Design an enzyme around this catalytic site. Structure first.
Site, PDB file in Angstrom:
ATOM      1  N   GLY A   1       6.973   2.836   0.293  1.00 44.68           N
ATOM      2  CA  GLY A   1       6.710   2.449  -1.087  1.00 44.68           C
ATOM      3  C   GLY A   1       5.735   3.374  -1.802  1.00 44.68           C
TER       4      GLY A   1
ATOM      5  CE  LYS B   1       1.434   5.856   5.976  1.00 42.66           C
ATOM      6  NZ  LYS B   1       0.970   4.914   7.051  1.00 42.66           N
TER       7      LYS B   1
ATOM      8  N   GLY C   1       4.538   0.941   8.343  1.00 43.19           N
ATOM      9  CA  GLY C   1       3.503   1.932   8.580  1.00 43.19           C
ATOM     10  C   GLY C   1       3.935   3.361   8.288  1.00 43.19           C
TER      11      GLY C   1
ATOM     12  N   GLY D   1       4.712   4.203   5.055  1.00 47.68           N
ATOM     13  CA  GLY D   1       4.276   4.427   3.681  1.00 47.68           C
ATOM     14  C   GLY D   1       5.386   4.666   2.673  1.00 47.68           C
TER      15      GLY D   1
ATOM     16  CG  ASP E   1      -0.700   4.958   2.744  1.00 53.08           C
ATOM     17  OD1 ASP E   1      -1.797   5.194   3.286  1.00 53.08           O
ATOM     18  OD2 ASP E   1       0.100   4.220   3.356  1.00 53.08           O
TER      19      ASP E   1
HETATM   20  C1  CDM Z   1      -3.913   1.328   6.747  1.00 57.34           C
HETATM   21  C2  CDM Z   1      -2.924   2.200   5.979  1.00 57.34           C
HETATM   22  O1  CDM Z   1      -1.603   1.683   6.155  1.00 57.34           O
HETATM   23  C3  CDM Z   1      -3.003   3.634   6.505  1.00 57.34           C
HETATM   24  O2  CDM Z   1      -1.912   4.450   6.083  1.00 57.34           O
HETATM   25  C4  CDM Z   1      -3.264   2.168   4.495  1.00 57.34           C
HETATM   26  O3  CDM Z   1      -4.572   2.709   4.303  1.00 57.34           O
HETATM   27  C5  CDM Z   1      -3.198   0.752   3.910  1.00 57.34           C
HETATM   28  O4  CDM Z   1      -3.742   0.785   2.581  1.00 57.34           O
HETATM   29  P1  CDM Z   1      -2.940   0.218   1.288  1.00 57.34           P
HETATM   30  O5  CDM Z   1      -1.450   0.182   1.602  1.00 57.34           O
HETATM   31  O6  CDM Z   1      -3.466   0.917   0.051  1.00 57.34           O
HETATM   32  O7  CDM Z   1      -3.517  -1.276   1.212  1.00 57.34           O
HETATM   33  P2  CDM Z   1      -2.578  -2.529   0.891  1.00 57.34           P
HETATM   34  O8  CDM Z   1      -1.419  -2.518   1.863  1.00 57.34           O
HETATM   35  O9  CDM Z   1      -2.333  -2.583  -0.598  1.00 57.34           O
HETATM   36  O10 CDM Z   1      -3.590  -3.711   1.287  1.00 57.34           O
HETATM   37  C6  CDM Z   1      -3.128  -4.942   1.810  1.00 57.34           C
HETATM   38  C7  CDM Z   1      -4.324  -5.661   2.404  1.00 57.34           C
HETATM   39  O11 CDM Z   1      -4.670  -5.090   3.678  1.00 57.34           O
HETATM   40  C8  CDM Z   1      -6.080  -5.247   3.907  1.00 57.34           C
HETATM   41  N1  CDM Z   1      -6.755  -3.960   4.053  1.00 57.34           N
HETATM   42  C9  CDM Z   1      -6.013  -2.787   3.629  1.00 57.34           C
HETATM   43  C10 CDM Z   1      -6.650  -1.496   3.727  1.00 57.34           C
HETATM   44  C11 CDM Z   1      -7.988  -1.386   4.279  1.00 57.34           C
HETATM   45  N2  CDM Z   1      -8.624  -0.106   4.393  1.00 57.34           N
HETATM   46  N3  CDM Z   1      -8.704  -2.555   4.716  1.00 57.34           N
HETATM   47  C12 CDM Z   1      -8.085  -3.846   4.600  1.00 57.34           C
HETATM   48  O12 CDM Z   1      -8.775  -4.990   5.026  1.00 57.34           O
HETATM   49  C13 CDM Z   1      -6.644  -5.850   2.637  1.00 57.34           C
HETATM   50  O13 CDM Z   1      -6.772  -7.243   2.829  1.00 57.34           O
HETATM   51  C14 CDM Z   1      -5.603  -5.535   1.592  1.00 57.34           C
HETATM   52  O14 CDM Z   1      -5.675  -6.416   0.479  1.00 57.34           O
END
Ligand code: CDM
Ligand code: ANP
Ligand code: CL
EC number: 2.7.1.148
Length: 283
Positions: free
Chosen positions: A107, A10, A103, A105, A141
């Site tokens: 995984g 993505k 970035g 996604g 994601d």
């Molecule tokens: C920002 C995106 O990459 C957009 O596609 C995603 O929403 C990331 O979300 P995600 O992969 O579900 O989150 P993870 O990668 O498991 O989170 C890792 C860490 O990044 C920080 N984190 C992530 C997502 C978010 N909305 N706020 C945060 O502050 C948090 O400390 C979290 O513990």
């Protein structure tokens, strides 16, 4: 019989950070579009209830791999309602083309593809809604990939609204550095006060990614990739980086810029699509 399933990447066409929750997570407004490009997952059913990922993914232990966590999660949930046939299991392998994180996604896409595929192959009969609900526990994601449609996401990424943004061609680059998501989100200079806006407003406004300023500042090679791409087309960071994409109207221009660009950009060209290749292959 072996079946093969797409696991597309993505892009966050835009990403705005609107604030921070009580637990430090960040509230966002972002737009997802799939790329017609990604990994390929192959599955062979088992009858002994085992889950075996046959291909090691660089630096990820079997039980830590999102492919295995997804398969076990579906197994447990389906069994809770008596929707998993006795003996259901699977051998799984992946042709991994996507970088780790970056970035794109990758995984999360792997997890979603596994949920959808095994639900289908095991004949559990769970709805996309049920799969996306359990998928959320594996990452924000995942539900987007599970649902299969370009989507606007709010809250901390869990609130989805399907939308239909323009489909463009992209040159996606990656300098090699692995940026951990938390490193960007914990940066003191990260913008966290971007006003929450309506979908209509966001769709007509110039697209940008609030994490980009931080990614450029802290990772010189990300800054350089951006510098090079901006010479040819509108370009920005996707997710928290390190991947950067350049936008093009046609495949030909995108591919011509790819031939010209530094080889260390590790670029690939792909078309953005609003229906996920996973769901498209299931039509
Ligand atoms: C920002 C995106 O990459 C957009 O596609 C995603 O929403 C990331 O979300 P995600 O992969 O579900 O989150 P993870 O990668 O498991 O989170 C890792 C860490 O990044 C920080 N984190 C992530 C997502 C978010 N909305 N706020 C945060 O502050 C948090 O400390 C979290 O513990
Ligand atoms: N099948 C898999 N493919 C890729 N990465 C995996 C997989 N299983 C676990 N991971 C881990 O996920 C990490 C990437 O963190 P990120 O959060 O998730 P992502 O969906 O792979 N990429 P991103 O678009 O940057 O959020 C990698 O460093 C891996 O350790
Ligand atoms: Cl949807």
């Amino acid at each position: 019989m072996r079946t093969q399933w797409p696991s597309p990447a993505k892009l966050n066409l835009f990403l705005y950070i609107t604030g921070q929750r009580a637990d430090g997570y960040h509230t966002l407004q972002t737009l997802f579009q799939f790329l017609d490009y990604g990994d390929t997952i192959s599955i062979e059913l088992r009858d002994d209830g085992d889950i075996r990922l046959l291909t090691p993914v660089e630096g990820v232990e079997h039980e830590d791999n999102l492919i295995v966590r997804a398969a076990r999660l579906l197994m447990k949930t389906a069994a809770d309602s008596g929707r998993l046939p006795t003996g259901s299991g699977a051998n799984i392998s992946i042709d991994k083309r996507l970088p780790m994180g970056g970035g794109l996604g990758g995984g999360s896409s792997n997890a979603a593809t596994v949920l959808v595929a095994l639900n289908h192959l095991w004949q559990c009969g769970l709805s996309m809604d049920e799969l996306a609900e359990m998928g959320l526990t594996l990452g924000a994601d995942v539900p987007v990939f599970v649902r299969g449609h370009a989507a606007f996401a709010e809250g901390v990424g869990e609130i989805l609204t399907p939308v239909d943004p323009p489909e463009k061609w992209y040159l996606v680059a990656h300098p090699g550095v692995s940026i951990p998501t938390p490193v960007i989100f914990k940066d003191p200079e990260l913008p966290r006060n971007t006003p929450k806006r309506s979908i209509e407003t966001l769709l007509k406004c110039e697209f940008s990614n609030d994490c980009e300023v931080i990614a450029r500042k802290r990772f010189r090679e990300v800054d350089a990739v951006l510098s090079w791409l901006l010479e040819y087309a509108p370009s920005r960071l996707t997710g928290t980086g390190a991947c950067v994409f350049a936008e093009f109207d046609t495949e030909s221009e995108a591919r011509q810029v790819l031939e010209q660009a530094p080889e260390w950009l590790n670029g690939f060209v792909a078309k953005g699509v609003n229906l996920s290749p996973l769901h498209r292959a299931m039509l």
